[PDB]
Ligand binder design. Sequence first.
Ligand SMILES: *[C@@H]1O[C@H](CO[C@@H]2O[C@@H](C)[C@@H](O)[C@@H](O)[C@@H]2O)[C@@H](O[C@@H]2O[C@H](CO)[C@@H](O[C@@H]3O[C@H](CO[C@H]4O[C@H](CO)[C@@H](O)[C@H](O)[C@@H]4O[C@@H]4O[C@H](CO)[C@@H](O)[C@H](O)[C@H]4NC(C)=O)[C@@H](O)[C@H](O[C@H]4O[C@H](CO)[C@@H](O)[C@H](O)[C@@H]4O[C@@H]4O[C@H](CO)[C@@H](O[C@@H]5O[C@H](CO)[C@H](O)[C@H](O)[C@H]5O)[C@H](O)[C@H]4NC(C)=O)[C@@H]3O)[C@H](O)[C@H]2NC(C)=O)[C@H](O)[C@H]1NC(C)=O
Ligand code: CL
Lengths: 222, 214
Amino acid sequence: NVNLLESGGGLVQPGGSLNLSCAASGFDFSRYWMSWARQAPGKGQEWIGEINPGSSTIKYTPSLKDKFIISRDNAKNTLYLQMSKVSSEDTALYYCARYGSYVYAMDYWGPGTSVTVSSAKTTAPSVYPLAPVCGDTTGSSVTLGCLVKGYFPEPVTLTWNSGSLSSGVHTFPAVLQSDLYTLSSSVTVTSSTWPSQSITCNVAHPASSTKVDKKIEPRGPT
Amino acid sequence: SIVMTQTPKFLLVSAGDRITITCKASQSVRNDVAWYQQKPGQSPKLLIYFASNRYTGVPDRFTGSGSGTDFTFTISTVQAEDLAVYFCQQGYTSPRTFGGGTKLEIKRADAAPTVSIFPPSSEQLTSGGASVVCFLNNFYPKDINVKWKIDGSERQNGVLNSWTDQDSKDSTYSMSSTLTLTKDEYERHNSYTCEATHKTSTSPIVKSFNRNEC
Ligand SMILES: *[C@@H]1O[C@H](CO[C@@H]2O[C@@H](C)[C@@H](O)[C@@H](O)[C@@H]2O)[C@@H](O[C@@H]2O[C@H](CO)[C@@H](O[C@@H]3O[C@H](CO[C@H]4O[C@H](CO)[C@@H](O)[C@H](O)[C@@H]4O[C@@H]4O[C@H](CO)[C@@H](O)[C@H](O)[C@H]4NC(C)=O)[C@@H](O)[C@H](O[C@H]4O[C@H](CO)[C@@H](O)[C@H](O)[C@@H]4O[C@@H]4O[C@H](CO)[C@@H](O[C@@H]5O[C@H](CO)[C@H](O)[C@H](O)[C@H]5O)[C@H](O)[C@H]4NC(C)=O)[C@@H]3O)[C@H](O)[C@H]2NC(C)=O)[C@H](O)[C@H]1NC(C)=O
Ligand SMILES: [Cl-]
């Protein structure tokens, strides 16, 4: 049961260095070619490089061949990407990928690990509960929200009732302004549900070790 | 390095229709072409390899064809779940370069947005800021305009908008609009309004509150 899981991403200052890891399971890692790719914000996928099972062949895209180094540890089932001299164009989601048997096609991609290259300071979010006033409803349902402001870098993870509530949820892409992100999420439930069944927004920001629960409480008729 | 030129960059199709994407290589790449599908929030999945072979478990409606420099990818009957970015790749020589991608959007029946407005939370007001939030949810088509008014006067400075990707389940879009003031400016006015203009109605959808009144 094939699995890849990248780790090691996060904020790195321009000109700095960062090592990414890719943990593999569910197949004989020592028999497969492996590769890295990345997707920068708003751009398509970009192939970074590849490495054969015995590490005797390692190839890169020319623009990256002097910044990045690919390596692998077959004994530990791990693939690595050594990033150095990074710049703003290296900000991206980085993916590790297996090549299919005897083909140069990428038949399994990991979930990705986010890297941000910036000199802006790490900042913790403020988390604000949003409830309607004056009894505002849309028909038979009510919409509540959660506003996450003033943080850096991405990512923030937002859930509702620790993930138990996923239907009727819209979580919007984070938007950057003056080196701080805003993110918001709305949840729509039936008027009967709330507030008798509590609704809580959970926000996690590992870069600032922030973990916040904000219960939504009424400020108008229910 | 070989350039893979992928067209069109965008596709808007109704469910049930056929689509064809084209990838042209700057030099011959034999049959060493792969096609991938990347759904919103997910990693890419391999659909086609060696130009025209379906990868294990890929459904029949996906096919590819071509050789040399000219390659196509076809969905015979598009389904709503096929909303994704599709991209080609040549694997003939290194670097194994990708095409620029095609974003496939799904056509559906018109839907007016569901609009909700929220005054600043008291927690934020304590810290000296004041954000007013308007959600405009589950609408189609995607083109929509939001205007903020404060005591009847349009406000543009301080507005931050975010849009979801098209939903794979109901094929709608949603949008969030946040107007951020200082607490002092917020308390200088009483009426806050978010007005949505969308092709479904001749009239704007107007959601409003007064700081002092219900
Ligand atoms: C990302 O990963 C990579 C790879 O790691 C592996 O893969 C990953 C995925 C993991 O699995 C990981 O577990 C794996 O290991 C990491 O790279 C490693 O990084 C460490 C540092 O953190 C390096 O360790 C250093 O190695 C130096 C020797 O390196 C040379 O030889 C190595 C073995 O062959 C070779 O691998 C290196 O590439 C390098 O090779 C040379 O390279 C140069 C230029 O590139 C060439 O010109 C040479 O020709 C070439 N030679 C050869 C034979 O190839 C050690 O010297 C160094 O020790 C010093 O530093 C540590 C602190 O880091 C101290 O604790 C030590 O005590 C020692 O300190 C030094 O002490 C001397 C005194 O004896 C001082 O000299 C004095 O200095 C004065 C001026 O200040 C005066 O000049 C005075 O006269 C003079 O005597 C030194 O100043 C002092 N230096 C310091 C800094 O304090 C250390 O052991 C690994 O080599 C490197 N491995 C690879 C493969 O790259 C990477 O870190 C990681 N990054 C991140 C962000 O995670
Ligand atoms: Cl590429």
